Design an enzyme around this catalytic site. Structure first.
Site, PDB file in Angstrom:
ATOM      1  N   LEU A 221       0.991  -0.794  -0.286  1.00 41.25           N
ATOM      2  CA  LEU A 221       0.261   0.112  -0.435  1.00 41.25           C
ATOM      3  C   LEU A 221       0.641   1.272  -0.233  1.00 41.25           C
ATOM      4  CD1 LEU A 221      -3.118  -0.968   2.510  1.00 41.25           C
ATOM      5  CD2 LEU A 221      -2.994  -0.312   0.256  1.00 41.25           C
ATOM      6  N   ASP A 222       0.638   2.290  -1.217  1.00 36.15           N
ATOM      7  CA  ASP A 222       1.111   3.483  -0.864  1.00 36.15           C
ATOM      8  C   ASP A 222       1.226   4.254  -2.114  1.00 36.15           C
ATOM      9  OD1 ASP A 222       3.567   5.006  -2.607  1.00 36.15           O
ATOM     10  OD2 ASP A 222       4.822   3.941  -0.959  1.00 36.15           O
TER      11      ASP A 222
ATOM     12  N   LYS B 212       1.993  -0.679  -8.783  1.00 35.83           N
ATOM     13  CA  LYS B 212       1.866   0.045  -7.346  1.00 35.83           C
ATOM     14  C   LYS B 212       3.137  -0.698  -6.318  1.00 35.83           C
ATOM     15  N   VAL B 213       3.621  -0.859  -5.343  1.00 35.49           N
ATOM     16  CA  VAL B 213       5.136  -0.562  -4.879  1.00 35.49           C
ATOM     17  C   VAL B 213       4.804  -2.422  -4.342  1.00 35.49           C
ATOM     18  CG1 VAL B 213       6.059  -0.557  -3.043  1.00 35.49           C
ATOM     19  CG2 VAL B 213       5.756   1.443  -3.958  1.00 35.49           C
TER      20      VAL B 213
ATOM     21  N   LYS C   6       8.737   0.025  -7.590  1.00 37.13           N
ATOM     22  CA  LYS C   6       7.388   0.833  -7.998  1.00 37.13           C
ATOM     23  C   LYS C   6       6.719   0.548 -10.244  1.00 37.13           C
ATOM     24  CE  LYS C   6       5.153   4.581  -8.394  1.00 37.13           C
ATOM     25  NZ  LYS C   6       3.788   4.593  -7.359  1.00 37.13           N
TER      26      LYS C   6
ATOM     27  N   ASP D 123       4.881  17.973  -1.686  1.00 36.50           N
ATOM     28  CA  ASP D 123       3.662  16.759  -1.166  1.00 36.50           C
ATOM     29  C   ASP D 123       4.488  16.492   0.423  1.00 36.50           C
ATOM     30  OD1 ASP D 123       1.604  16.287  -0.796  1.00 36.50           O
ATOM     31  OD2 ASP D 123       1.483  14.521  -1.669  1.00 36.50           O
TER      32      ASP D 123
HETATM   33  C1  LIG Z   1       4.560  -0.245   4.140  1.00 35.72           C
HETATM   34  N1  LIG Z   1       5.521   0.525   3.124  1.00 35.72           N
HETATM   35  C2  LIG Z   1       6.949   0.220   2.562  1.00 35.72           C
HETATM   36  O1  LIG Z   1       7.434  -0.166   3.784  1.00 35.72           O
HETATM   37  C3  LIG Z   1       7.429   0.963   2.604  1.00 35.72           C
HETATM   38  C4  LIG Z   1       6.892   1.792   0.666  1.00 35.72           C
HETATM   39  C5  LIG Z   1       7.245   2.501   0.177  1.00 35.72           C
HETATM   40  C6  LIG Z   1       8.688   2.933  -0.431  1.00 35.72           C
HETATM   41  C7  LIG Z   1       9.229   1.820   0.898  1.00 35.72           C
HETATM   42  C8  LIG Z   1       8.853   0.943   2.215  1.00 35.72           C
HETATM   43  N2  LIG Z   1      10.595   1.828   0.467  1.00 35.72           N
HETATM   44  C9  LIG Z   1      10.985   2.504  -0.431  1.00 35.72           C
HETATM   45  N3  LIG Z   1       9.740   2.900  -1.372  1.00 35.72           N
HETATM   46  C10 LIG Z   1       9.937   3.710  -1.775  1.00 35.72           C
HETATM   47  C11 LIG Z   1      10.885   4.743  -2.184  1.00 35.72           C
HETATM   48  C12 LIG Z   1      10.218   5.390  -3.290  1.00 35.72           C
HETATM   49  C13 LIG Z   1       9.199   5.186  -4.111  1.00 35.72           C
HETATM   50  C14 LIG Z   1       9.571   6.611  -4.942  1.00 35.72           C
HETATM   51  N4  LIG Z   1      10.847   6.658  -5.166  1.00 35.72           N
HETATM   52  C15 LIG Z   1      10.640   7.807  -4.700  1.00 35.72           C
HETATM   53  O2  LIG Z   1       8.965   8.534  -4.027  1.00 35.72           O
HETATM   54  C16 LIG Z   1      11.938   9.072  -4.912  1.00 35.72           C
HETATM   55  C17 LIG Z   1      11.902  10.415  -4.914  1.00 35.72           C
HETATM   56  C18 LIG Z   1      13.407  10.249  -5.058  1.00 35.72           C
HETATM   57  C19 LIG Z   1      14.540  11.970  -5.358  1.00 35.72           C
HETATM   58  C20 LIG Z   1      13.573  13.120  -4.184  1.00 35.72           C
HETATM   59  C21 LIG Z   1      12.969  12.663  -2.922  1.00 35.72           C
HETATM   60  C22 LIG Z   1      12.467  14.604  -2.713  1.00 35.72           C
HETATM   61  C23 LIG Z   1      11.344  14.962  -3.371  1.00 35.72           C
HETATM   62  C24 LIG Z   1      12.242  15.268  -5.088  1.00 35.72           C
HETATM   63  C25 LIG Z   1      12.812  13.690  -5.375  1.00 35.72           C
HETATM   64  N5  LIG Z   1      14.147   9.312  -5.563  1.00 35.72           N
HETATM   65  C26 LIG Z   1      15.039   9.289  -6.616  1.00 35.72           C
HETATM   66  N6  LIG Z   1      13.253   8.780  -5.536  1.00 35.72           N
HETATM   67  C27 LIG Z   1       8.480   4.253  -4.237  1.00 35.72           C
HETATM   68  C28 LIG Z   1       8.099   3.365  -2.631  1.00 35.72           C
END
Ligand SMILES: CNC(=O)c1ccc2c(c1)ncn2-c1ccc(CNC(=O)c2cc(Cc3ccccc3)n(C)n2)cc1
Length: 274
Positions: free
Chosen positions: A17-18, A20-21, A35, A128
């Site tokens: 849930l996010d 999809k992820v 993703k 956001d």
């Molecule tokens: C119960 N759920 C979880 O446990 C859970 C959910 C999501 C997770 C996760 C664990 N562990 C990593 N995810 C995750 C991280 C990133 C993304 C998509 N990616 C980005 O959001 C992103 C942002 C940036 C750079 C940036 C940061 C801030 C503002 C502008 C730009 N970069 C390189 N990627 C999707 C999932």
């Protein structure tokens, strides 16, 4: 250190849930988040624009910003592969049965400040900032993210293709941005979101639970309603309440910058929190 071109054959996965992820185990490199942005019947051709943008995103490298590990760019499948943050988002950590000690909350606030000052120092305006975009590892260190992916121009674009088979922000949104489709986000808008995140870290909950309706809350906030500081049961240092109040100031020019918050908060953190 750089963005790796990964293959879908190198993984096995599971849903989640996010914004999809799905967590994925890479055959040789271990656990990752995948993703999948597009899964379609249309071999797409502008692979390089998508790959260069991920390389450009990958340039935001800081201890407090989520690292992109790789990308899958193939026929009908385009996926971003990211590091896994094992505790999920900050709200999940805060609503957990075990309570987070004041010292760890203090560190989390400092790390959000460092991440935001880094992003603003790169000319990146998050639009956001909210507890769902604040991810937590097993050691309770944070890394800021943008799960809506608005910052990635082409990946967002690729998602909205129509051969592709594939909110809540209002509480953290600065009032100038409320009821406006054209309000451009500024660094001071992120500072407002941080102040509401600050309240939530101490209240352990989402703000405005007594709001009946969305237009009521939007109008209330714009007239100056704020999260109820009295509905924090735990002890919040007076310094943090004062900071929270300055950061959600109605006038955006009254709000500090993240570098000015860091200069005030770090000595206090070290002297008062741990
Ligand atoms: C119960 N759920 C979880 O446990 C859970 C959910 C999501 C997770 C996760 C664990 N562990 C990593 N995810 C995750 C991280 C990133 C993304 C998509 N990616 C980005 O959001 C992103 C942002 C940036 C750079 C940036 C940061 C801030 C503002 C502008 C730009 N970069 C390189 N990627 C999707 C999932």
């Amino acid at each position: 250190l750089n963005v790796i071109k990964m293959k879908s054959s190198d993984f096995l996965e599971s849903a989640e849930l996010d914004s999809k992820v799905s967590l994925a185990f890479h055959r040789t490199q271990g656990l990752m988040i995948m993703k999948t942005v597009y899964k379609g019947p249309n071999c797409i051709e502008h692979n390089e624009a998508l790959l260069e943008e991920a390389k450009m995103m990958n340039r935001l490298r800081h201890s407090r910003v989520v690292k992109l590990l790789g990308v899958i760019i193939e026929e009908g499948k385009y996926s971003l592969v990211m590091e896994y943050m094992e505790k999920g988002n900050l709200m999940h950590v805060l609503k957990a049965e075990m309570s987070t000690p004041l010292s760890v909350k203090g560190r989390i606030i400092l790390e959000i400040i460092e991440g935001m000052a880094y992003l603003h120092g790169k000319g990146v305006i998050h639009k956001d900032l909210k507890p769902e975009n604040i991810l937590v590892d097993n050691d309770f260190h944070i890394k800021i993210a943008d799960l809506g992916l608005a910052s990635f121009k082409m990946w967002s674009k690729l998602n909205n293709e129509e051969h592709n088979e594939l909110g809540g922000t209002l509480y953290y949104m600065a009032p100038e941005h409320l009821n406006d489709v054209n309000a451009k986000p500024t660094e001071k808008s992120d500072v407002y979101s941080f102040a509401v995140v600050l309240w939530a870290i101490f209240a352990n909950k989402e703000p405005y639970e007594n709001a009946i309706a969305e237009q009521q809350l939007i109008m209330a906030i714009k007239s100056g309603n704020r999260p109820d500081v009295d509905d924090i049961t735990e002890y919040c240092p007076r310094e943090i309440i004062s900071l929270m109040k300055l950061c959600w100031e109605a006038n955006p020019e009254a709000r500090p910058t993240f570098p000015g918050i860091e200069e005030k908060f770090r000595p206090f953190y070290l002297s008062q929190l741990e």
